[PDB]
Design a protein around this nucleic acid. Structure first.
Ligand SMILES: NC[C@@H]1O[C@H](O[C@H]2[C@@H](O)[C@H](O[C@@H]3[C@@H](O)[C@H](N)C[C@H](N)[C@H]3O[C@H]3O[C@H](CO)[C@@H](O)[C@H](O)[C@H]3N)O[C@@H]2CO)[C@H](N)[C@@H](O)[C@@H]1O
Ligand SMILES: NC[C@@H]1O[C@H](O[C@H]2[C@@H](O)[C@H](O[C@@H]3[C@@H](O)[C@H](N)C[C@H](N)[C@H]3O[C@H]3O[C@H](CO)[C@@H](O)[C@H](O)[C@H]3N)O[C@@H]2CO)[C@H](N)[C@@H](O)[C@@H]1O
Ligand SMILES: NC[C@@H]1O[C@H](O[C@H]2[C@@H](O)[C@H](O[C@@H]3[C@@H](O)[C@H](N)C[C@H](N)[C@H]3O[C@H]3O[C@H](CO)[C@@H](O)[C@H](O)[C@H]3N)O[C@@H]2CO)[C@H](N)[C@@H](O)[C@@H]1O
Ligand SMILES: NC[C@@H]1O[C@H](O[C@H]2[C@@H](O)[C@H](O[C@@H]3[C@@H](O)[C@H](N)C[C@H](N)[C@H]3O[C@H]3O[C@H](CO)[C@@H](O)[C@H](O)[C@H]3N)O[C@@H]2CO)[C@H](N)[C@@H](O)[C@@H]1O
Ligand SMILES: NC[C@@H]1O[C@H](O[C@H]2[C@@H](O)[C@H](O[C@@H]3[C@@H](O)[C@H](N)C[C@H](N)[C@H]3O[C@H]3O[C@H](CO)[C@@H](O)[C@H](O)[C@H]3N)O[C@@H]2CO)[C@H](N)[C@@H](O)[C@@H]1O
Ligand SMILES: NC[C@@H]1O[C@H](O[C@H]2[C@@H](O)[C@H](O[C@@H]3[C@@H](O)[C@H](N)C[C@H](N)[C@H]3O[C@H]3O[C@H](CO)[C@@H](O)[C@H](O)[C@H]3N)O[C@@H]2CO)[C@H](N)[C@@H](O)[C@@H]1O
Ligand SMILES: [Mg+2]
Ligand SMILES: [Mg+2]
Ligand SMILES: [Mg+2]
Ligand SMILES: [Mg+2]
Ligand SMILES: [Mg+2]
Ligand SMILES: [Mg+2]
Ligand SMILES: [Mg+2]
Ligand SMILES: [Mg+2]
Ligand SMILES: [Mg+2]
Ligand SMILES: [Mg+2]
Ligand SMILES: [Mg+2]
Ligand SMILES: [Mg+2]
Ligand SMILES: [Mg+2]
Ligand SMILES: [Mg+2]
Ligand SMILES: [Mg+2]
Ligand SMILES: [Mg+2]
Ligand SMILES: [Mg+2]
Ligand SMILES: [Mg+2]
Ligand SMILES: [Mg+2]
Ligand SMILES: [Mg+2]
Ligand SMILES: [Mg+2]
Ligand SMILES: [Mg+2]
Ligand SMILES: [Mg+2]
Ligand SMILES: [Mg+2]
Ligand SMILES: [Mg+2]
Ligand SMILES: [Mg+2]
Ligand SMILES: [Mg+2]
Ligand SMILES: [Mg+2]
Ligand SMILES: [Mg+2]
Ligand SMILES: [Mg+2]
Ligand SMILES: [Mg+2]
Ligand SMILES: [Mg+2]
Ligand SMILES: [Mg+2]
Ligand SMILES: [Mg+2]
Ligand SMILES: [Mg+2]
Ligand SMILES: [Mg+2]
Ligand SMILES: [Mg+2]
Ligand SMILES: [Mg+2]
Ligand SMILES: [Mg+2]
Ligand SMILES: [Mg+2]
Ligand SMILES: [Mg+2]
Ligand SMILES: [Mg+2]
Ligand SMILES: [Mg+2]
Ligand SMILES: [Mg+2]
Ligand SMILES: [Mg+2]
Ligand SMILES: [Mg+2]
Ligand SMILES: [Mg+2]
Ligand SMILES: [Mg+2]
Ligand SMILES: [Mg+2]
Ligand SMILES: [Mg+2]
Ligand SMILES: [Mg+2]
Ligand SMILES: [Mg+2]
Ligand SMILES: [Mg+2]
Ligand SMILES: [Mg+2]
Ligand SMILES: [Mg+2]
Ligand SMILES: [Mg+2]
Ligand SMILES: [Mg+2]
Ligand SMILES: [Mg+2]
Ligand SMILES: [Mg+2]
Ligand SMILES: [Mg+2]
Ligand SMILES: [Mg+2]
Ligand SMILES: [Mg+2]
Ligand SMILES: [Mg+2]
Ligand SMILES: [Mg+2]
Ligand SMILES: [Mg+2]
Ligand SMILES: [Mg+2]
Ligand SMILES: [Mg+2]
Ligand SMILES: [Mg+2]
Ligand SMILES: [Mg+2]
Ligand SMILES: [Mg+2]
Ligand SMILES: [Mg+2]
Ligand SMILES: [Mg+2]
Ligand SMILES: [Mg+2]
Ligand SMILES: [Mg+2]
Ligand SMILES: [Mg+2]
Ligand SMILES: [Mg+2]
Ligand SMILES: [Mg+2]
Ligand SMILES: [Mg+2]
Ligand SMILES: [Mg+2]
Ligand SMILES: [Mg+2]
Ligand SMILES: [Mg+2]
Ligand SMILES: [Mg+2]
Ligand SMILES: [Mg+2]
Ligand SMILES: [Mg+2]
Ligand SMILES: [Mg+2]
Ligand SMILES: [Mg+2]
Ligand SMILES: [Mg+2]
Ligand SMILES: [Mg+2]
Ligand SMILES: [Mg+2]
Ligand SMILES: [Mg+2]
Ligand SMILES: [Mg+2]
Ligand SMILES: [Mg+2]
Ligand SMILES: [Mg+2]
Ligand SMILES: [Mg+2]
Ligand SMILES: [Mg+2]
Ligand SMILES: [Mg+2]
Ligand SMILES: [Mg+2]
Ligand SMILES: [Mg+2]
Ligand SMILES: [Mg+2]
Ligand SMILES: [Mg+2]
Ligand SMILES: [Mg+2]
Ligand SMILES: [Mg+2]
Ligand SMILES: [Mg+2]
Ligand SMILES: [Mg+2]
Ligand SMILES: [Mg+2]
Ligand SMILES: [Mg+2]
Ligand SMILES: [Mg+2]
Ligand SMILES: [Mg+2]
Ligand SMILES: [Mg+2]
Ligand SMILES: [Mg+2]
Ligand SMILES: [Mg+2]
Ligand SMILES: [Mg+2]
Ligand SMILES: [Mg+2]
Ligand SMILES: [Mg+2]
Ligand SMILES: [Mg+2]
Ligand SMILES: [Mg+2]
Ligand SMILES: [Mg+2]
Ligand SMILES: [Mg+2]
Ligand SMILES: [Mg+2]
Ligand SMILES: [Mg+2]
Ligand SMILES: [Mg+2]
Ligand SMILES: [Mg+2]
Ligand SMILES: [Mg+2]
Ligand SMILES: [Mg+2]
Ligand SMILES: [Mg+2]
Ligand SMILES: [Mg+2]
Ligand SMILES: [Mg+2]
Ligand SMILES: [Mg+2]
Ligand SMILES: [Mg+2]
Ligand SMILES: [Mg+2]
Ligand SMILES: [Mg+2]
Ligand SMILES: [Mg+2]
Ligand SMILES: [Mg+2]
Ligand SMILES: [Mg+2]
Ligand SMILES: [Mg+2]
Ligand SMILES: [Mg+2]
Ligand SMILES: [Mg+2]
Ligand SMILES: [Mg+2]
Ligand SMILES: [Mg+2]
Ligand SMILES: [Mg+2]
Ligand SMILES: [Mg+2]
Ligand SMILES: [Mg+2]
Ligand SMILES: [Mg+2]
Ligand SMILES: [Mg+2]
Ligand SMILES: [Mg+2]
Ligand SMILES: [Mg+2]
Ligand SMILES: [Mg+2]
Ligand SMILES: [Mg+2]
Ligand SMILES: [Mg+2]
Ligand SMILES: [Mg+2]
Ligand SMILES: [Mg+2]
Ligand SMILES: [Mg+2]
Ligand SMILES: [Mg+2]
Ligand SMILES: [Mg+2]
Ligand SMILES: [Mg+2]
Ligand SMILES: [Mg+2]
Ligand SMILES: [Mg+2]
Ligand SMILES: [Mg+2]
Ligand SMILES: [Mg+2]
Ligand SMILES: [Mg+2]
Ligand SMILES: [Mg+2]
Ligand SMILES: [Mg+2]
Ligand SMILES: [Mg+2]
Ligand SMILES: [Mg+2]
Ligand SMILES: [Mg+2]
Ligand SMILES: [Mg+2]
Ligand SMILES: [Mg+2]
Ligand SMILES: [Mg+2]
Ligand SMILES: [Mg+2]
Ligand SMILES: [Mg+2]
Ligand SMILES: [Mg+2]
Ligand SMILES: [Mg+2]
Ligand SMILES: [Mg+2]
Ligand SMILES: [Mg+2]
Ligand SMILES: [Mg+2]
Ligand SMILES: [Mg+2]
Ligand SMILES: [Mg+2]
Ligand SMILES: [Zn+2]
Lengths: 119, 50, 87, 100, 60
RNA sequence: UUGACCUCAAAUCAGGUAGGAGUACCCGCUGAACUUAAGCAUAUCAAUAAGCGGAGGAAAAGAAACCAACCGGGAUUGC
RNA sequence: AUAUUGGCGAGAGACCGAUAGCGAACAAGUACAGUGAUGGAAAGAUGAAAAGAACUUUGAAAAGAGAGUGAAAAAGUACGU
RNA sequence: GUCGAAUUUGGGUAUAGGGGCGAAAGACUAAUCGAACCAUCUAGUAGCUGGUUCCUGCCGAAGUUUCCCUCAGGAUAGCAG
RNA sequence: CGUGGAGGUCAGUGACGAAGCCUAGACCGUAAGGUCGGGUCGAACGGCCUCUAGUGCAGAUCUUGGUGGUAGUAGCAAAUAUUCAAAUGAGAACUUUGAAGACUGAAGUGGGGAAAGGUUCCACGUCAACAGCAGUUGGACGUGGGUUAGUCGAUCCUAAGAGAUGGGGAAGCUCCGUUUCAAAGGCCUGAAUGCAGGCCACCAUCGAAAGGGAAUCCGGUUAAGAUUCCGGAACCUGGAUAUGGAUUCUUCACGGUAACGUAACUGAAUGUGGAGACGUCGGCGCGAGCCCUGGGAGGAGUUAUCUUUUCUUCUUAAC
RNA sequence: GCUUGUGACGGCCCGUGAAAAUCCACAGGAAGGAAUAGUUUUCAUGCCAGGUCGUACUGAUAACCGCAGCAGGUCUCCAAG
RNA sequence: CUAUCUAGCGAAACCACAGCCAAGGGAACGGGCUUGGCAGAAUCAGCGGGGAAAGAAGACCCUGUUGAGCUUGACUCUAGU
RNA sequence: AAACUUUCAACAACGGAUCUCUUGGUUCUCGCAUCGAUGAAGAACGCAGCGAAAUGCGAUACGUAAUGUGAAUUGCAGAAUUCCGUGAAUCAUCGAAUCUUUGAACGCACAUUGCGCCCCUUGGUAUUCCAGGGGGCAUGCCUGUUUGAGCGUCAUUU
């Protein structure tokens, strides 16, 4: 039951804030009835919903902070490439590309010649 | 041990909660091996070592 | 009374639990873990100890990060989201 | 063989001096402008016993030349030095028991 | 009597006990149960009835 | 009086990087004895085990201060 | 081009067949031992299917005896032979 | 035997293996001490004990020679297939 | 001769019963072995030609696992001791209650704690195993309950001791060092916060649940917690702080010869003094609690006889 | 009288018998300071608050160590006639 | 208080196969072989003659081209100096 | 003659050989190259309607988002079974997050759930004191920056 990922993404922050609070109100009230009854399997879907609400609220604020940093040279390490320690310190495609002026002319003067031999 | 370091009361609290017989329903499960709890402990028999 | 009588005197513990490795190898007076090596920077291992090694090596643990690296490498370390099917 | 007893002593351990209850180290006043040119006066405030030393110590106060404070010294009492006496210290100082 | 976060000191308890159930809290005594969960003894002031507010949370 | 210089400091200075794990293979250091010799010391085990420092996907080696002495050959690695 | 009792993913064998084969085919580096470094097991097989023996009966009861299930109970969770 | 001091003792702390510690017994150093406990080198070497798994058929020995830090072992010739 | 596996072949055997196992049943071979019947069994297996080995057990104080005789035997004899009745239960030498007999005899078989254990505490259920007889009981089994602090500890301080830092060794793991061959800071004030004041500066930290140390007591309460809860009475540190009182026109108090006294009585840098703060033994004075004890006011036992009798209540917390 | 605290003292040493945190005090005189008033928060009274971990029970001829419900071993307080 | 008898509980040592002698010869001290004596179920409490009884691959002794603790103007070295 | 003992058979015990099974081991080959201060390896404690393990996860706790898939999961319960559906699921996939207490492990400690300092914000009169919330303060080294020191030192003084 409970909440749905796409429906939440439309609602505004300040509504989500209140969404949560009455889910916490419910889940709290659940745990009361829970110990007065022969179990209560129902409480699973609301505590999962709280995760979803909180996932979305996170999605927004992260994306929002993603915008505020767009195009800039220095972005929070939270939001960076990840990939690999070893990887992300490898030379950039630019840095590996550089070639000494002596060579760039040698790489022009006599670059590899495609040929063949018939008969 | 009388007035006890928290970590040890915590470590104690753990082993207390995991000394129980098997839940009866674990043995109805399809493809079930476990008949009894084989890791069960006792204060008289085996000591915890903190 | 090198035997049974002298045993009755053992109430003190040369080691308590080692924060790093969770054994009780941490020498109270020596302030060094016997098994793991804490608080040395490196973790304790010896080549004559190959059984001790396979007790503590990778994959005896939870692999909480490492385990997923292979899938993430399998495809390109993908950035971004998944495009669905659409129409 | 084994390591004989007289080798084991240089490692400290058991063989270190038992220092707890001692007074400080027994040292003269530092050699300074005061003693090198004139002399200086101080009261021996008390003599007193120093553990594991069979030679009583005399505690001599002095007034700090270069600041307003009291400066206590630990001297080895010279037999006839006495609480309350004035010790005089320097090249200009007189020739009397207790003077340096 | 409430189970409480093991991370919650006597202030956080009293603040959150007031805020949630809308009552005046005289004093707070916390132990940690054998199982490793904190139990809080939260006394309500004279102005309130603890049994009322009890089954206002719906246990009685 | 005011302005540079060399050197050398400090900052929760702005941006970074090192550590640890792994260790089958790889570059070094350090370094045995059991053993064989029908004894044993050189020798052998072995430029091995254990110990230490540093990598990669390979490492390393490499365009000769080479090999040859031939009518000469021509970076390195491996079979 | 070369190395590779590690890592990841595969295909195989005149290999071993539960005292074998890795120590571990199993909640196995587990249960347990040691202050500690370390030491370190045992243990696979009801049946096609639980149909896991309703009911009666003696018994304080565990059970026994009827009686049922099943191809088989000369398979009854002490379970293939 | 000793029992008001070279007394008895808790805990904290220090000394580690050719090391410690010893009012000295080679004592003690975790039931381990004329060299601790743990793992590895290690399946250490053994002219020395012990064992060495089916059947039948034919042939059939030696404890002697010489040399050996050789005398419980080898080489060597002889006997044997 | 025999065993695991391999190529080839009998288009070999088989759920209408393969393999295995059991057969004081049959036959073949000198033998290793081969073949058959019967029983039990449940899914595979054999003949011949070759290939190949982790290929044949009675021993090795062999390895692992299982089982015997010994044998219903040695034993179940330290710690003075049990008995009657009831209740409960299918069941009682062993449980509960009552009674009687006894013991530990406070250097205890009493009342608490330290190390250590870790739920053993308590309650309800409950006896397969365990409690070397027994078990209706248990420190067992099952299910639940339970440990409340400003004042008690930890936390703080320093001890022997341990240990970073400039640094100096060592190939290195690492070693030395703790104020040293170092440019080692962090306070209080004004001008909401920077500059101007300014002092002061040898020095991380770890190390005591018996050392040092801020401060709580009584009464009541639970099945199980209490110097923690409740009721009452306090105190300590930390903030805020208003009113009262005190002091000053001789501005920062008066009195006493003095020892000193008073409800208060401004005090920066800096210096210094004291408490923290300390051995062991011996008697002597004094107090507290305990011991002994008289009157009296209650309760209890004995009382053929004797005893103005024997026992028992009469209490006072920190502040 | 017993335990115990304290007061005043005597003796013993080639033994003369911890440290730090903390607290108050003194000397000093930088400084602010009153009259129609300004002074002091070491005098009284009044306001608010005090987090974190431990807290059960055994502590032994059964709850610790000694394979165990072991005649062993394991520091201490109270102590009636 | 045991032992002993009973209810209940219930091990271990050890074990080629076993368990009556005399002699003989025999690896020169036999339970077994040879010749004789003999020889009758099933057993209980005792006992310490035998079982060259049990305990532990003799420590004494020798052998081993096997060690180790230790000593020294052995052989060969070595920190320090 | 019984008992007893011994031998054989049958049935029954004891025990787990043998036979047949094999989601395992073992060895050969083939392909690929990715751990960590963006916090790894490893550890501790937790997380399910009813779990002690194993397994998975992290207070968003046997999982949240995305993608596919097309109806289950299953021990009992429960559901919304929300099936021509943005949709079952202990499914596959994984590109988005969460990720307690830790650990090279980073304010200092650490047999302690011990103890400082800075910044923002909320409440208690509140610049100060207490409390809740949020973010911070390791080391060596490089490049840069800002601020300093030295009669090491060149100019300017005036
Ligand atoms: N008890 C702590 C120590 O455990 C050591 O041994 C422990 C290890 O062999 C094993 O512990 C492993 C650990 O190795 C591994 N690296 C991580 C793993 N989670 C641990 O697991 C353990 O912990 C869980 C949880 O408490 C327990 O249920 C259980 O003891 C065990 N599975 O479990 C043993 C528990 O005793 C030693 N016995 C001794 O040093 C000491 O007792
Ligand atoms: N080795 C300890 C030394 O103690 C010395 O300190 C000396 C004094 O300062 C210290 O005296 C303490 C005093 O600090 C403390 N606050 C009060 C205490 N009563 C005094 O004690 C001393 O004096 C009294 C009276 O004379 C004696 O009864 C006592 O035995 C004595 N130790 O005791 C020492 C004399 O016994 C120095 N600090 C130094 O030399 C060193 O640390
Ligand atoms: N007695 C009535 C019920 O029997 C039930 O149990 C039934 C069975 O589970 C039980 O089976 C027993 C078995 O437990 C035990 N291990 C022995 C034997 N294999 C079986 O025996 C049973 O089956 C045999 C064969 O037909 C009958 O001859 C016999 O009478 C019967 N008891 O026998 C019962 C049938 O008679 C439950 N125990 C319970 O509901 C109740 O006691
Ligand atoms: N143990 C506490 C003591 O009890 C004592 O209690 C005694 C008193 O209360 C009381 O005394 C009464 C007396 O008042 C009345 N007039 C007569 C009565 N027989 C006495 O009692 C008597 O008891 C027996 C005689 O049988 C004597 O041995 C005792 O000494 C005497 N007091 O009887 C008690 C007997 O001991 C005292 N009050 C006093 O010492 C203290 O409180
Ligand atoms: N000391 C002064 C006197 O002390 C008396 O009491 C003292 C004595 O009872 C006892 O003092 C003893 C003394 O008796 C005996 N004869 C000598 C001994 N040294 C003293 O001991 C005293 O001094 C030593 C240092 O020497 C300290 O270490 C110790 O703590 C202290 N008690 O300790 C008390 C404190 O010093 C009385 N209070 C009184 O007569 C007077 O004040
Ligand atoms: N200061 C170093 C930096 O710390 C940063 O990390 C900051 C936080 O992410 C980190 O927070 C830690 C957290 O890691 C951890 N898992 C939980 C912990 N409570 C937090 O701890 C922080 O606050 C606590 C408060 O008690 C302090 O005790 C602790 O020293 C501090 N690191 O602590 C740092 C702030 O103090 C970055 N990891 C990195 O840039 C760098 O290492
Ligand atoms: Mg299992
Ligand atoms: Mg264990
Ligand atoms: Mg032991
Ligand atoms: Mg201890
Ligand atoms: Mg120690
Ligand atoms: Mg050390
Ligand atoms: Mg560290
Ligand atoms: Mg591996
Ligand atoms: Mg793996
Ligand atoms: Mg695996
Ligand atoms: Mg994760
Ligand atoms: Mg020596
Ligand atoms: Mg010294
Ligand atoms: Mg508390
Ligand atoms: Mg509870
Ligand atoms: Mg910066
Ligand atoms: Mg490294
Ligand atoms: Mg390496
Ligand atoms: Mg040799
Ligand atoms: Mg040899
Ligand atoms: Mg030799
Ligand atoms: Mg060589
Ligand atoms: Mg090596
Ligand atoms: Mg790499
Ligand atoms: Mg390659
Ligand atoms: Mg290269
Ligand atoms: Mg060239
Ligand atoms: Mg070439
Ligand atoms: Mg391989
Ligand atoms: Mg490997
Ligand atoms: Mg795949
Ligand atoms: Mg292939
Ligand atoms: Mg088997
Ligand atoms: Mg096996
Ligand atoms: Mg088996
Ligand atoms: Mg087998
Ligand atoms: Mg085999
Ligand atoms: Mg095995
Ligand atoms: Mg097990
Ligand atoms: Mg071991
Ligand atoms: Mg089976
Ligand atoms: Mg099955
Ligand atoms: Mg009936
Ligand atoms: Mg009944
Ligand atoms: Mg039937
Ligand atoms: Mg019918
Ligand atoms: Mg049936
Ligand atoms: Mg039928
Ligand atoms: Mg049929
Ligand atoms: Mg059948
Ligand atoms: Mg069957
Ligand atoms: Mg059944
Ligand atoms: Mg069964
Ligand atoms: Mg069976
Ligand atoms: Mg069967
Ligand atoms: Mg089967
Ligand atoms: Mg004598
Ligand atoms: Mg005497
Ligand atoms: Mg001593
Ligand atoms: Mg060594
Ligand atoms: Mg030697
Ligand atoms: Mg040394
Ligand atoms: Mg001695
Ligand atoms: Mg001798
Ligand atoms: Mg031993
Ligand atoms: Mg010993
Ligand atoms: Mg001896
Ligand atoms: Mg020796
Ligand atoms: Mg040892
Ligand atoms: Mg050992
Ligand atoms: Mg061999
Ligand atoms: Mg070798
Ligand atoms: Mg050899
Ligand atoms: Mg020989
Ligand atoms: Mg010769
Ligand atoms: Mg021989
Ligand atoms: Mg020959
Ligand atoms: Mg011939
Ligand atoms: Mg074959
Ligand atoms: Mg084979
Ligand atoms: Mg074939
Ligand atoms: Mg064939
Ligand atoms: Mg057929
Ligand atoms: Mg067969
Ligand atoms: Mg026959
Ligand atoms: Mg047949
Ligand atoms: Mg049969
Ligand atoms: Mg058959
Ligand atoms: Mg079958
Ligand atoms: Mg079949
Ligand atoms: Mg054949
Ligand atoms: Mg073989
Ligand atoms: Mg065999
Ligand atoms: Mg056999
Ligand atoms: Mg045999
Ligand atoms: Mg037997
Ligand atoms: Mg018999
Ligand atoms: Mg019996
Ligand atoms: Mg008997
Ligand atoms: Mg006896
Ligand atoms: Mg008795
Ligand atoms: Mg009776
Ligand atoms: Mg009756
Ligand atoms: Mg009795
Ligand atoms: Mg009774
Ligand atoms: Mg008596
Ligand atoms: Mg006493
Ligand atoms: Mg005693
Ligand atoms: Mg108690
Ligand atoms: Mg109880
Ligand atoms: Mg028991
Ligand atoms: Mg019994
Ligand atoms: Mg019984
Ligand atoms: Mg219980
Ligand atoms: Mg206190
Ligand atoms: Mg401290
Ligand atoms: Mg120190
Ligand atoms: Mg150091
Ligand atoms: Mg220096
Ligand atoms: Mg500033
Ligand atoms: Mg203390
Ligand atoms: Mg109590
Ligand atoms: Mg109260
Ligand atoms: Mg005295
Ligand atoms: Mg008081
Ligand atoms: Mg008296
Ligand atoms: Mg002394
Ligand atoms: Mg004072
Ligand atoms: Mg003054
Ligand atoms: Mg309590
Ligand atoms: Mg208590
Ligand atoms: Mg007691
Ligand atoms: Mg005992
Ligand atoms: Mg025990
Ligand atoms: Mg006794
Ligand atoms: Mg005892
Ligand atoms: Mg004692
Ligand atoms: Mg007898
Ligand atoms: Mg009997
Ligand atoms: Mg027995
Ligand atoms: Mg035995
Ligand atoms: Mg024996
Ligand atoms: Mg014999
Ligand atoms: Mg004769
Ligand atoms: Mg004869
Ligand atoms: Mg004879
Ligand atoms: Mg005879
Ligand atoms: Mg014989
Ligand atoms: Mg015969
Ligand atoms: Mg014959
Ligand atoms: Mg005869
Ligand atoms: Mg004759
Ligand atoms: Mg005899
Ligand atoms: Mg015998
Ligand atoms: Mg013996
Ligand atoms: Mg013996
Ligand atoms: Mg021998
Ligand atoms: Mg021997
Ligand atoms: Mg001997
Ligand atoms: Mg000899
Ligand atoms: Mg020889
Ligand atoms: Mg030798
Ligand atoms: Mg017989
Ligand atoms: Mg089958
Ligand atoms: Mg579920
Ligand atoms: Mg529940
Ligand atoms: Mg887990
Ligand atoms: Mg699961
Ligand atoms: Mg369902
Ligand atoms: Mg269903
Ligand atoms: Mg999935
Ligand atoms: Mg995921
Ligand atoms: Mg993390
Ligand atoms: Mg952390
Ligand atoms: Mg940290
Ligand atoms: Mg914060
Ligand atoms: Mg940095
Ligand atoms: Zn460790």
């Amino acid at each position: 039951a409970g909440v749905k990922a796409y429906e939440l993404r439309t609602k505004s922050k300040e509504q989500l804030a209140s969404q949560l609070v009455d889910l916490k109100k419910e889940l709290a009230e659940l745990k009361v009835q829970k110990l007065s009854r022969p179990s209560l399997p129902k409480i699973k879907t609301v505590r999962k919903s709280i995760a979803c609400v909180l996932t979305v609220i996170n999605e927004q604020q992260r994306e929002a902070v993603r915008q505020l940093y767009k195009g800039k040279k220095y972005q929070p390490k939270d939001l960076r490439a990840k990939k690999t320690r070893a990887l992300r310190r490898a030379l950039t495609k630019f840095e590996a590309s550089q070639v000494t002026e002596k060579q760039r002319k040698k790489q022009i003067a006599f670059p590899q010649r495609k040929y063949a031999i018939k008969a | 041990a009388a007035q006890k370091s928290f970590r040890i009361k915590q470590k104690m609290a753990k082993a207390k909660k995991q000394n129980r017989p098997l839940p009866q329903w674990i043995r109805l499960r399809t493809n079930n091996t476990i008949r009894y709890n084989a890791k069960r402990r006792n204060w008289r028999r085996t000591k915890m070592n903190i | 009374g090198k035997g049974t009588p002298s045993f009755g005197k053992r109430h003190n513990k040369s080691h308590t639990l080692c924060n790093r490795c969770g054994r009780r190898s941490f020498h109270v007076q020596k302030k060094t873990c016997s098994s793991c090596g804490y608080p040395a920077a490196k973790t304790r291992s010896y080549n004559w100890g190959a059984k001790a090694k396979r007790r503590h090596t990778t994959g005896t643990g939870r692999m909480r990060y490492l385990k997923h690296v292979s899938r993430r490498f399998k495809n390109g370390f993908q950035t971004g989201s998944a495009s669905k099917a659409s129409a | 063989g084994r390591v004989i007893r007289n080798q084991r002593k240089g490692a400290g351990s058991i063989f270190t001096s038992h220092t707890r209850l001692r007074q400080g180290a027994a040292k003269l006043r530092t050699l300074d402008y005061a003693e090198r040119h004139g002399y200086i006066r101080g009261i021996v405030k008390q003599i007193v016993h120093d553990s594991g030393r069979g030679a009583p110590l005399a505690k001599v106060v002095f007034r700090d030349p270069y600041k307003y404070r009291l400066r206590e010294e630990i001297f080895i009492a010279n037999e006839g030095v006495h609480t309350g006496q004035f010790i005089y210290a320097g090249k200009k100082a007189s020739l009397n028991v207790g003077n340096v | 009597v409430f189970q409480v976060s093991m991370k919650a000191n006597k202030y956080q308890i009293k603040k959150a006990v007031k805020e949630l159930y809308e009552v005046d809290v005289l004093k707070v005594n916390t132990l940690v149960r054998p199982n490793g969960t904190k139990k809080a003894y939260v006394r309500l002031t004279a102005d309130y009835d603890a049994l009322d507010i009890a089954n206002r949370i719906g246990y009685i």
